[PDB]
Amino acid sequence: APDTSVSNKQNFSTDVIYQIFTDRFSDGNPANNPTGAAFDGSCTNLRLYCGGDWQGIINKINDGYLTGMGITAIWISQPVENIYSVINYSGVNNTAYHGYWARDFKKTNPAYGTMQDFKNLIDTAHAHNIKVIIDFAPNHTSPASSDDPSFAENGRLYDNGNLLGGYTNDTQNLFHHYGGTDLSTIENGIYKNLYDLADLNHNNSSVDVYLKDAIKMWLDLGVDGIRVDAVKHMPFGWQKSFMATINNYKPVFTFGEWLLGVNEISPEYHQFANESGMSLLDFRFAQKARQVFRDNTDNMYGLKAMLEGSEVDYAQVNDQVTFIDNHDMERFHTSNGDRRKLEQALAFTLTSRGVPAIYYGSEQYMSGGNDPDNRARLPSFSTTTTAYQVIQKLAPLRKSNPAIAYGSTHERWINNDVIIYERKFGNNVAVVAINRNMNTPASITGLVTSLPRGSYNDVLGGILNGNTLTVGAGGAASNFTLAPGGTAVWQYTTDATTPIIGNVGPMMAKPGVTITIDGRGFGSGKGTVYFGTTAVTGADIVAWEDTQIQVKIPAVPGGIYDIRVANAAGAASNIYDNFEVLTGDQVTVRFVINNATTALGQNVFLTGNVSELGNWDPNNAIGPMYNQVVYQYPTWYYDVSVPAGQTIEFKFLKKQGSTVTWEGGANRTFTTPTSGTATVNVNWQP
Ligand SMILES: C[C@H]1O[C@H](O[C@H]2[C@H](O)[C@@H](O)[C@H](O)O[C@@H]2CO)[C@H](O)[C@@H](O)[C@@H]1N[C@H]1C=C(CO)[C@@H](O[C@H]2O[C@H](CO)[C@@H](O)[C@H](O)[C@H]2O)[C@H](O)[C@H]1O
Ligand SMILES: [Ca+2]
Ligand SMILES: [Ca+2]
Numbered sequence: 001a002p003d004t005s006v007s008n009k010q011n012f013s014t015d016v017i018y019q020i021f022t023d024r025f026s027d028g029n030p031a032n033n034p035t036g037a038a039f040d041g042s043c044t045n046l047r048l049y050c051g052g053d054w055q056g057i058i059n060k061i062n063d064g065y066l067t068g069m070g071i072t073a074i075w076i077s078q079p080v081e082n083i084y085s086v087i088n089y090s091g092v093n094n095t096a097y098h099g100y101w102a103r104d105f106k107k108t109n110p111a112y113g114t115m116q117d118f119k120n121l122i123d124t125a126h127a128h129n130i131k132v133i134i135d136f137a138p139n140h141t142s143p144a145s146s147d148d149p150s151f152a153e154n155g156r157l158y159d160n161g162n163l164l165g166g167y168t169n170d171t172q173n174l175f176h177h178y179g180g181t182d183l184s185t186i187e188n189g190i191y192k193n194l195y196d197l198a199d200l201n202h203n204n205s206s207v208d209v210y211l212k213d214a215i216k217m218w219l220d221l222g223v224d225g226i227r228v229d230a231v232k233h234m235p236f237g238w239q240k241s242f243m244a245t246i247n248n249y250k251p252v253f254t255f256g257e258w259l260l261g262v263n264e265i266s267p268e269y270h271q272f273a274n275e276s277g278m279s280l281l282d283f284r285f286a287q288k289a290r291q292v293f294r295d296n297t298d299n300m301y302g303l304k305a306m307l308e309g310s311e312v313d314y315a316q317v318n319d320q321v322t323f324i325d326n327h328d329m330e331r332f333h334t335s336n337g338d339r340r341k342l343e344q345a346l347a348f349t350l351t352s353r354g355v356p357a358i359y360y361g362s363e364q365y366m367s368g369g370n371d372p373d374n375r376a377r378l379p380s381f382s383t384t385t386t387a388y389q390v391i392q393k394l395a396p397l398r399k400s401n402p403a404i405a406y407g408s409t410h411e412r413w414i415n416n417d418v419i420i421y422e423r424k425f426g427n428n429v430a431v432v433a434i435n436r437n438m439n440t441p442a443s444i445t446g447l448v449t450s451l452p453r454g455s456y457n458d459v460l461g462g463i464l465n466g467n468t469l470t471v472g473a474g475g476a477a478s479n480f481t482l483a484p485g486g487t488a489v490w491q492y493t494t495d496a497t498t499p500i501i502g503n504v505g506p507m508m509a510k511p512g513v514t515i516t517i518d519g520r521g522f523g524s525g526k527g528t529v530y531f532g533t534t535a536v537t538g539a540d541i542v543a544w545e546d547t548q549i550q551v552k553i554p555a556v557p558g559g560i561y562d563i564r565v566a567n568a569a570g571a572a573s574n575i576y577d578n579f580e581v582l583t584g585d586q587v588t589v590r591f592v593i594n595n596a597t598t599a600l601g602q603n604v605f606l607t608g609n610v611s612e613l614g615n616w617d618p619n620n621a622i623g624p625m626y627n628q629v630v631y632q633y634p635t636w637y638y639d640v641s642v643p644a645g646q647t648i649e650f651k652f653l654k655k656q657g658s659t660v661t662w663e664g665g666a667n668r669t670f671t672t673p674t675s676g677t678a679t680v681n682v683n684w685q686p
Contacts, residue, residue, distance in 0.1 A: 013518075077135055101141070212245045342387060351432045441486075
């Protein structure tokens with residue numbers, strides 16, 4: 001089907017996501033509203049339920065509020081049943097309005113709707129070519145005190161009505177009981193509890209299998225994407241086996257939230273987007289966009305350096321979800337902030353690389369500080385605000401112009417307050433000019449673009465004071481003055497004669513899974529897909545058309561491969577690298593090694609004979625292992641995704657800089673479980 005189709009669950013670069021807090025959008029069914037102390041119909045106590053639901057979203061899709069804006073994907077609050085308690089935290093009452101305090105991952109939150117209401121939402125969104133992304137928060141259940149079992153619902157987890165267990169007297173060890181995190185280390189943030197939430201123990205086989213069973217249930221209901229909460233607070237090896245469960249079953253676009261502060265660049269963050277099998281909410285983008293367009297704490301050279309730096313640091317930058325604010329930030333618009341600042345920041349996000357997300361109420365200029373004040377009920381459904389019109393004119397270009405959905409980003413003109421960049425994909429191009437200075441016009445001289453000659457009209461129709469661009473020979477533009485606050489977008493689309501790959505989804509799966517390769521210029525007739533030098537042709541190519549190919553992963557050994565497409569005429573595409581072929585289905589095994597004493601700067605790692613363990617390469621070994629919370633030094637431990645049902649060979653090693661010290665003796669062997677969990681507990685062999 002085409003790359004822009006609503007049925008494309010794997011890749012979202014052609015979409016614009018509207019992020020809805022279900023409770024704060026529209027109460028379409030008053031009969032499902034919480035009663036008593038859990039409800040506030042005026043929505044002035046922002047920690048109570050206001051009444052918004054799935055019928056309210058169905059209504060705003062039907063009457064054209066969302067589709068008039070050009071939205072093609074909706075991201076809603078976690079749909080699962082939550083605790084019913086009103087918890088009083090030092091005077092103020094709190095409810096699960098936000099969907100994050102789960103008690104049954106197999107049932108719906110009835111304040112939002114019934115399972116029939118969820119089905120009706122999937123089907124009415126799809127009939128209007130809107131994809132549906134759900135939050136999924138598998139790190140915890142709800143507020144709990146094992147010392148006081150009467151507090152809230154004591155973190156109890158149910159499985160479709162059946163109690164699996166609570167936090168007090170957890171003889172099954174369904175939960176973690178190591179105390180609360182001080183966030184000092186990533187290790188500390190993973191196994192210790194955050195706030196008062198009952199942390200799930202993913203090394204318990206029942207919890208592992210249950211969470212994997214529950215995500216497949218929501219995939220069977222037709223969801224198109226998953227946003228997973230608190231990814232830096234769950235074992236990276238368990239999350240990799242969780243992604244393999246999704247990708248080897250029904251692959252959908254998945255991304256997580258790993259929060260970064262202003263001008264924080266974390267290698268672990270980039271490593272997670274590049275290796276987990278999921279992408280990330282692009283905080284690096286969001287924070288620099290706020291410094292330049294909102295806070296004025298950096299200028300356009302900072303913006304340029306972030307766009308240029310992130311194109312390299314993210315192995316698949318077209319999968320990162322961008323935004324200028326969301327549920328974990330103060331709203332972009334401030335009380336004394338010029339609305340043009342919000343309007344330019346939205347135009348910047350909508351024409352940039354990645355998958356744009358707009359937080360509900362941006363188009364109505366909502367302001368508010370941090371939680372809960374950034375989650376007020378949206379005040380109006382006015383269809384005529386400038387911000388609504390800016391999204392309406394620009395959001396369609398992600399479907400119609402492949403330079404915007406997939407293209408590279410090239411700075412063509414810049415100074416402290418102005419940037420003009422070009423997006424380019426084959427011969428499709430979009431050029432965007434932004435002057436953030438609200439009182440000084442900018443004289444543009446010397447602009448050269450990849451546009452053919454013509455008089456290009458601003459796609460924004462001059463509403464943000466843009467102008468026509470006259471382009472002559474060699475892509476040279478005639479000089480112009482960019483108005484104060486001016487933003488203009490100019491574009492040209494045409495056919496690709498040669499194959500170009502813009503995006504691939506999923507990026508990690510076992511042999512036989514169908515992956516989706518999107519781009520332009522593939523042609524009508526089936527050609528060849530290369531995974532490395534292995535060619536797959538004929539019946540293994542499930543679908544071929546000019547913008548999308550669906551092909552089965554060949555039976556190649558586990559490892560990472562370059563993908564390349566050749567059309568029927570033998571013309572080959574660009575390489576899309578970093579694809580990981582798994583050895584098979586995954587299970588997460590806890591590896592524990594005792595008596596492994598180390599020097600300062602020396603850490604313990606694991607490697608072995610399958611690609612998941614780095615294929616005996618010390619530079620690709622698993623670790624550094626942990627050694628503080630679950631087990632303490634000199635015992636080291638780590639949760640590692642490993643192929644299910646087979647005998648692996650492995651050894652531990654110590655690494656300090658360039659020096660590797662391998663365990664002596666024979667190679668260790670272990671037969672892994674077919675999907676469930678397991679622990680290996682061994683002693684260092686000198
Ligand atoms: C649990 C929180 O998770 C998300 O934010 C994460 C992010 O995904 C991580 O990878 C990142 O690195 O750390 C962030 C912080 O954990 C999500 O976006 C947050 O909004 C989410 N917050 C929830 C959960 C709770 C905790 O029960 C609520 O806070 C309550 O807890 C405190 C202390 O007990 C009380 O004083 C408050 O009054 C409670 O509301 C939040 O309301 C809710 O937003
Ligand atoms: Ca309601
Ligand atoms: Ca955790």
